[PDB]
Amino acid sequence: QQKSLLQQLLTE
Amino acid sequence: IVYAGYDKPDTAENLLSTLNRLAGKQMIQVVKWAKVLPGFKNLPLEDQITLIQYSWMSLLSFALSWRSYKHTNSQFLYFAPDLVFNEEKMHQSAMYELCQGMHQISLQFVRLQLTFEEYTIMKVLLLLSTIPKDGLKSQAAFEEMRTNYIKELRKMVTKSPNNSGQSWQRFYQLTKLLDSMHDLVSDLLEFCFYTFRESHALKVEFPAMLVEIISDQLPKVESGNAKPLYFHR
Numbered sequence: 001q002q003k004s005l006l007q008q009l010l011t012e
Numbered sequence: 013i014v015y016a017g018y019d020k021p022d023t024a025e026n027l028l029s030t031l032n033r034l035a036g037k038q039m040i041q042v043v044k045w046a047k048v049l050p051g052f053k054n055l056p057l058e059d060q061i062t063l064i065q066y067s068w069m070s071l072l073s074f075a076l077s078w079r080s081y082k083h084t085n086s087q088f089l090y091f092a093p094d095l096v097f098n099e100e101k102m103h104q105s106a107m108y109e110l111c112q113g114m115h116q117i118s119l120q121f122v123r124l125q126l127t128f129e130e131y132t133i134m135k136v137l138l139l140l141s142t143i144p145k146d147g148l149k150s151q152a153a154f155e156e157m158r159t160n161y162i163k164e165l166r167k168m169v170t171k172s173p174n175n176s177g178q179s180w181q182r183f184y185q186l187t188k189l190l191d192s193m194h195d196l197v198s199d200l201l202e203f204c205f206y207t208f209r210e211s212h213a214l215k216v217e218f219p220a221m222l223v224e225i226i227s228d229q230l231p232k233v234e235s236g237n238a239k240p241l242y243f244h245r
């Protein structure tokens with residue numbers, strides 16, 4: 001469920 | 013420009029913790045750079061993540077070589093404005109060897125008089141230098157992107173009047189330098205995987221960005237699910 005920091009930065 | 017915040021006794025453990033904290037902050041910049049790169053931006057999210065997780069160390073090593081070249085004429089490794097040193101400061105054999113290896117790459121930038129334009133395209137090629145053993149989700153899209161950047165570098169080098177009489181030899185020296193990054197980077201990653209696994213015992217700290225990347229990268233590398241791409245091998 002919780003997104004990695006890499007996924008967060010790529011999708012923000 | 014990311015600062016190291018270099019404090020505390022000068023120990024290998026403390027230097028590595030400082031470098032890891034710095035690497036995590038540099039990685040926020042690398043992801044922002046990758047996100048808007050033509051072609052990459054189009055790859056599926058799982059592939060974008062896969063590529064960054066395999067090549068993060070290569071991207072940081074290449075940027076370190078560029079900083080070292082621009083700020084010190086490759087006499088020292090310019091980690092940050094407040095953290096500049098070379099292999100001569102290293103007492104531990106492995107750490108001396110890794111610094112010396114990084115120093116030799118940065119010296120190739122002096123040998124070639126590498127331009128910012130060459131550096132920019134070469135950095136993209138490093139992001140696209142390792143894939144899974146069975147390929148990516150969008151393997152065809154990736155292959156087209158990688159071919160396009162190789163052609164962009166080749167055209168830039170061969171068309172430049174600064175390279176007249178030796179442009180094809182220069183292009184092959186640049187692609188040999190990219191291949192040589194695989195060897196150095198494998199060695200840096202072996203050291204990194206060791207301090208990561210022995211973090212508590214060695215007292216080597218890692219920021220959340222690196223804990224997350226290494227936790228996903230390490231099982232891939234350990235299982236042999238990592239295919240390095242070479243120009244000459």
Ligand SMILES: CNC(=O)C[C@H]1COc2cc(F)c(CC(C)C)cc2N1C(=O)c1ccc2c(c1)NC(=O)CO2
Pocket residue numbers: 028029031032034035038069072073076089091107110111114200201203204205207208216
């Ligand atoms: C902020 N990083 C950068 O600017 C450059 C990056 C990439 O190229 C480097 C080259 C280099 F010679 C050294 C010096 C070390 C080997 C004493 C470090 C790094 N870099 C690392 O981040 C790094 C590498 C291996 C590690 C670690 C960190 N942490 C560990 O715990 C051990 O393995």
Ligand SMILES: [Cl-]
Pocket residue numbers: 218219220221
């Ligand atoms: Cl953190």
